[PDB]
């Protein structure tokens, strides 16, 4: 998993067995990623909606989510961030996330006028979502709090970066 980041990578069978031998808690890690990514749409829309209801002027004529072009771009960004975080959880580290997603992003938003406070709230909601799905708050019952804190840390890196 690095040739992707345009043929898709397929990892099953022996390749999946070895993958799970090469990462911390492979089975639980894949359940956590499954539960975030399978709920990604609801996470994205719930986080953007919460950012907006907390600050309605974002969709006023002077807000950065006004017009469909901007609303769509914002939902897109929230989904991009969520997917890079999910890949960071899949791979058990934040290198691709920081370099290919976060490196240079804050200055870009500063150039565009994308408000820091709204992004902060949106990311915080996506974090609360992912932690709640990893801790389940379909799989065998047990303790997934380690992976939950890991993904929490990847969100915290996003928050620090932008």
């Amino acid at each position: 998993f690095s040739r992707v980041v345009s043929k898709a990578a397929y990892v099953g069978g022996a390749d999946l067995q070895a993958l799970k031998k090469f990462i911390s808690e492979g089975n639980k890690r894949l359940d956590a990623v499954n539960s975030i990514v399978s709920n990604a749409s609801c996470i994205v829309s719930d986080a953007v909606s919460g950012m907006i209801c907390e600050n309605p002027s974002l969709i006023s004529p002077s807000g950065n989510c006004y017009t469909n072009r901007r609303m769509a771009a914002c939902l897109r960004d929230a989904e991009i961030i969520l997917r890079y975080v999910s890949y960071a959880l899949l791979s058990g580290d934040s290198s691709v996330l920081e370099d290919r997603c976060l490196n240079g992003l804050k200055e870009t938003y500063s150039s565009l006028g994308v408000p820091a406070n709204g992004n902060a709230r949106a990311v915080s909601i996506m974090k609360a979502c992912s932690v709640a799905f990893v801790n389940n708050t379909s799989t065998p019952q047990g303790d997934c709090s380690g992976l939950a804190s890991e993904v929490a840390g990847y969100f915290d890196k996003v928050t620090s970066a932008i």
Partner: protein, 72 residues
């Protein structure tokens, strides 16, 4: 660096043990139930259609309601 591309990793997890649809995308048999599970990863451009954004604006503009989860 962030390359302004829009592309993000799209991950699909298939825990499809016991599934009657046969595996055919991965090419390394292990003779265990790992043969019926797969992690797929692509790098896809994320796009949100302005129709979708409009319908989302229609859900959001009440500024009051929400899903079950979440503080107010």
């Amino acid at each position: 660096g962030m390359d302004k591309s829009a592309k993000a990793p799209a991950i699909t997890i298939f825990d499809h043990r016991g599934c009657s649809r046969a595996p055919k995308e991965s090419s390394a048999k292990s003779g265990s139930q790992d043969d019926e599970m797969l992690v797929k990863v692509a790098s896809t451009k994320v796009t949100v259609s302005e129709d979708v954004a409009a319908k989302k604006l229609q859900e959001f503009i009440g500024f009051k309601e929400k899903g079950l989860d979440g503080s107010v």
